Structure formats: structure tokens, C-alpha cells
Design a protein around this ligand. Structure first.
Ligand SMILES: CCCCCCCC/C=C\CCCCCCCC(=O)OC[C@H](O)CO
Ligand SMILES: CCCCCCCC/C=C\CCCCCCCC(=O)OC[C@H](O)CO
Ligand SMILES: CCCCCCCC/C=C\CCCCCCCC(=O)OC[C@H](O)CO
Ligand SMILES: CCCCCCCC/C=C\CCCCCCCC(=O)OC[C@H](O)CO
Ligand SMILES: *C\C=C(C)/C=C/C=C(C)/C=C/C1=C(C)CCCC1(C)C
Length: 231
């Protein structure tokens, strides 16, 4: 558990995802409105999955060594298993808020799976120059997602209840800003060019992970948008 200088950030991350899961679970009790239940279920699952994968990194299961640049490099592969299942759920929270059509949802979840799966391939690739080829396909998939969130969602939200429009626009903005930092941390951290050491990279991903999952949920689940309009 100790011996790895990043361990303090993995321990903190685990604690914050556990506490976030327990909070949403308790808040979610008794909610009867069928629409709100769907938002509670999706949004509580996100930190529950991330809690289990942070714990696996803490205990050292979610780590493997990958040779490249003539050295053995520690790669936390458990990050991608986490993101494979949590990032489509976050996009589903947004798409259900604006009642997106089924074709649009499919396009978003599919592009997201491509983004995370090519990120994983790049992380495990042993030929140094090819890691950046995968990084660029993965980043291209993420630019399609952000485009849909602005031209495919923002246009629909504005034709809906004001409480829905308002909450979507805050969540959309939060999403665009936090998600776009991820490819940058990868590129300058241990998986890429290696300018930032692993212990600081782990700190940066931990602040982004907690903000984009627990912070995101705090904003959505206090809104009136998730309830049906009723007397
Ligand atoms: C120290 C605490 C550690 C953190 C806890 C360990 C996390 C792993 C455990 C459990 C999964 C529990 C259920 C996760 C799914 C919750 C979904 C939900 O609550 O949905 C409510 C909805 O309203 C219903 O219809
Ligand atoms: C709504 C969707 C909910 C989704 C919830 C699903 C979460 C599944 C989690 C984990 C097991 C996956 C572990 C992958 C198996 C790797 C085992 C292996 O081959 O060796 C690794 C080595 O033991 C160590 O470094
Ligand atoms: C491993 C990576 C892939 C699996 C990870 C799971 C991620 C989330 C699941 C699904 C999106 C598929 C489309 C589901 C959208 C349906 C929402 C909808 O359109 O509404 C239908 C409902 O009938 C109205 O009441
Ligand atoms: C739209 C929101 C998401 C956009 C995300 C796409 C970001 C574009 C990528 C890269 C330029 C930075 C490349 C700089 C890398 C040079 C590293 C180097 O070789 O320098 C060694 C070091 O500086 C000696 O100390
Ligand atoms: C659970 C939290 C969130 C916000 C996860 C998001 C992760 C990404 C947006 C990852 C993107 C990557 C790309 C675009 C290219 C480099 C490799 C990554 C997989 C980190």
C-alpha cells in the first residue's frame, strides 16, 4: 500500500468516491418520482464503480509494467476500466435531461467507447512513437462528442422547460472543461512524454475525477430539472 509515493492520492480518491456514493444513495431513498429515480440510479452508480477501481489501484491490483523507452514503466490500467463504464453513464445523464433521440445517444456512447478503448491501447503499446498515434485517434473521438454536446444538444435544450435548459447549460460547460483536460495530462505524464512524474499526474487525475463525478452529481441531483412537472 505504501512504497509508492502516489499512494496518498489513491487513498484520498478512494475515500472521496466512497463518501460520494454513500451520500447519493441516502439522498436517493424515498424518491418516488419515476423520472428522478432514473437520474439517481445512473448518477449513484458512477462513483460506486470509480470507488472499486480506485481501491484496486490503492492495493496494487490495477497496475502493470510496460517497457518503452528502454525502461519499465508503471501503467495503472484500472483507470481505463473505470472510464469505460463511467463516462457513458455521465453522457446518458446529459442526454436524458434534454430527451435526445435514440440515434444521437447511440452515436455518443459509441464514440465514447472508441475514445476510451483507443486510450487503453495507446497506454499498453510498447513502440514509443505509436502511443501517440493512438492518442490522436482517441482525441479525435472526443472532439466529436464535444461537438454533439454543442450542436445536437444545446439546440434542443433551449426548446424545453427553463429549469431543464438552465441545468443542462451548467452541466454541459462543466463537462467540456473537465473532459478536455484529460488528454493533456496523459500527454505530459508518465504515459506519454514523461515531463510530469507519476505522483503529480496521480494528484491531477484525482482532482479531475472527483470533480467530474461527485461534483457533477451534486449539481444535477439538487436541481428541479430531474423531476417531472406535476401538481
Ligand atoms: C465505506 C463505503 C464504501 C462505498 C460503498 C461501496 C460501493 C460498492 C457497494 C455497493 C453497490 C450499492 C448499490 C449501487 C447502485 C445504487 C443505485 C441506486 O441507488 O438507485 C436508486 C434508484 O432510485 C433505485 O430505483
Ligand atoms: C452499469 C455497468 C456496471 C459495470 C460494473 C462492471 C465492473 C467489473 C469490474 C472488474 C473486473 C475486471 C478485471 C479485468 C480482468 C484482468 C485480469 C488479468 O488478466 O490479470 C490482471 C492481473 O491479475 C492484475 O494486474
Ligand atoms: C462497455 C461500454 C458499453 C456498455 C456500457 C453501458 C453504458 C450505458 C448504456 C447504454 C446506451 C444505449 C442506449 C440506451 C439509451 C436509452 C434511453 C432512451 O432513449 O429512452 C428509452 C426509454 O424507453 C424511454 O422511456
Ligand atoms: C479542445 C480541447 C482539447 C484539446 C486537447 C488537444 C491538445 C493539443 C496537443 C498538444 C501540443 C502540446 C505538445 C507539447 C509536447 C512537447 C514535449 C517536449 O518534447 O518537450 C520536452 C520538455 O519540455 C523538456 O523539459
Ligand atoms: C471519470 C471522469 C472523466 C471525466 C473521464 C474522462 C476521460 C477522458 C476524457 C479520457 C480521454 C483520453 C483521450 C481523449 C486521449 C488520451 C487518453 C485518454 C483516454 C485519457
Amino acid at each position: 500500500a505504501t512504497g509508492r509515493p502516489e499512494w496518498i492520492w489513491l487513498a484520498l480518491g478512494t475515500a472521496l468516491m466512497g463518501l460520494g456514493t454513500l451520500y447519493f444513495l441516502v439522498k436517493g431513498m424515498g424518491v418516488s418520482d419515476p423520472d428522478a429515480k432514473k437520474f439517481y440510479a445512473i448518477t449513484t452508480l458512477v462513483p460506486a464503480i470509480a470507488f472499486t477501481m480506485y481501491l484496486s489501484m490503492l492495493l496494487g491490483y490495477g497496475l502493470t509494467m510496460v517497457p518503452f523507452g528502454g525502461e519499465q514503466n508503471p501503467i495503472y490500467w484500472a483507470r481505463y476500466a473505470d472510464w469505460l463504464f463511467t463516462t457513458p453513464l455521465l453522457l446518458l445523464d446529459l442526454a436524458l435531461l434534454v430527451d435526445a433521440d435514440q440515434g444521437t445517444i447511440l452515436a455518443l456512447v459509441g464514440a465514447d467507447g472508441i475514445m476510451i478503448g483507443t486510450g487503453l491501447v495507446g497506454a499498453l503499446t510498447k513502440v514509443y512513437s505509436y502511443r501517440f498515434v493512438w492518442w490522436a485517434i482517441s482525441t479525435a473521438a472526443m472532439l466529436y462528442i464535444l461537438y454533439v454536446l454543442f450542436f445536437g444538444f444545446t439546440s434542443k435544450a433551449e426548446s424545453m422547460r427553463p429549469e431543464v435548459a438552465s441545468t443542462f447549460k451548467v452541466l454541459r460547460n462543466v463537462t467540456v472543461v473537465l473532459w478536455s483536460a484529460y488528454p493533456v495530462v496523459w500527454l505530459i505524464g508518465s504515459e506519454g512524454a514523461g515531463i510530469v512524474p507519476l505522483n503529480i499526474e496521480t494528484l491531477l487525475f484525482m482532482v479531475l475525477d472527483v470533480s467530474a463525478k461527485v461534483g457533477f452529481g451534486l449539481i444535477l441531483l439538487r436541481s428541479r430539472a430531474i423531476f417531472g412537472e406535476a401538481e
